[PDB]
Subunit: 67 residues, 6 copies
Amino acid sequence: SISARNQLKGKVVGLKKGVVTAEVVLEIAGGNKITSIISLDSVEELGVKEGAELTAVVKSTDVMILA
Amino acid sequence: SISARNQLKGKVVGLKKGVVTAEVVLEIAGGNKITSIISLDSVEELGVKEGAELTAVVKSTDVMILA
Amino acid sequence: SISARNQLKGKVVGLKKGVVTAEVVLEIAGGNKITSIISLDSVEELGVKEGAELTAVVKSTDVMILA
Amino acid sequence: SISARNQLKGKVVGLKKGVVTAEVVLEIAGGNKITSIISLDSVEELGVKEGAELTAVVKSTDVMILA
Amino acid sequence: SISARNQLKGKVVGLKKGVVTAEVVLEIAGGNKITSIISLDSVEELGVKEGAELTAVVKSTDVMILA
Amino acid sequence: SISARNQLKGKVVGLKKGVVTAEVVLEIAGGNKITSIISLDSVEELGVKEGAELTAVVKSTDVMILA
Ligand SMILES: [Cl-]
Ligand SMILES: [Cl-]
Ligand SMILES: [Cl-]
Ligand SMILES: [Mg+2]
Ligand SMILES: [Mg+2]
């Protein structure tokens, strides 16, 4: 278990690979979408591809509130 | 509009105020919960309180992927 | 209103687009310059281009102090 | 020199100490204010105090753009 | 497995609890120390305490380079 | 001196340059490896290259704990 309190299960619905990073779009429950930019190495290692079941993890101090 | 692509609508179900920061917990669609730690100053200025409808925003580079 | 307490108005003076991300340079008051790396999708969506008036937003917990 | 491309000189106009963190407010050129939340331990070691001339540093990937 | 490429095993040598967050200090291989500020809720749930063997994880986009 | 409490001295053992960003892999004491994604401008400016002695700097609120 990791300290990051946001752990949202999702399915990949978009993937764009660059040279250093890749953009991963996950659909999570309720139809929300989360977009992640991570290293291309991690995409490759985790075998990220359309339909993959993965979890989006965000540290609490990175979540802003919009009112 | 802001460049942060993740905007998750939610309702505050928990709030703990510290001296410098506060922890806000939002229930989002599908029952997922998002936890945010922001400055106490912002909580006050945005009038964040239990039950409030608000939106969590996260920059894509802050979203990690777990497999 | 967003919780991020740093909101600096600026004008775009530099833009470099990659495949996933783009680098945006804003000149803010007093001659300071802020450089941002964000998703290319956002640049495109916000119509970022030289001279555009935009605001740089930074969460407090991301600001370091150098003495 | 550090890779963080944003280095903004300023003067501390506010300081609030908590137990683990502290909020530092710096006035920068043009009157902009930058707000930083850092560890209390750092405030102590860098001798951060009201009126001190200090520099705020932000990594480019933490700067969002608002339009 | 998670996309965050940096995973550093360590032993807790310091722990300071606040109301919202907690500061965890880990000694890692070679004697380097890593300092983490996470939510108090997580410290409790992961049962973080002095002497515990734990792993520090950091997303690559959060590591700055200083020369 | 900078407020970020993690300052890990290391040597570059991997470098991959993209158009906006670059991935830098540093070996630090004890054989630990740190991977950083930073702006290509900074890579160029700091003259990052294999064997360079540099320091990985991470803010405490970016360090997660895995148990
Ligand atoms: Cl967290
Ligand atoms: Cl903030
Ligand atoms: Cl820090
Ligand atoms: Mg952060
Ligand atoms: Mg970040």
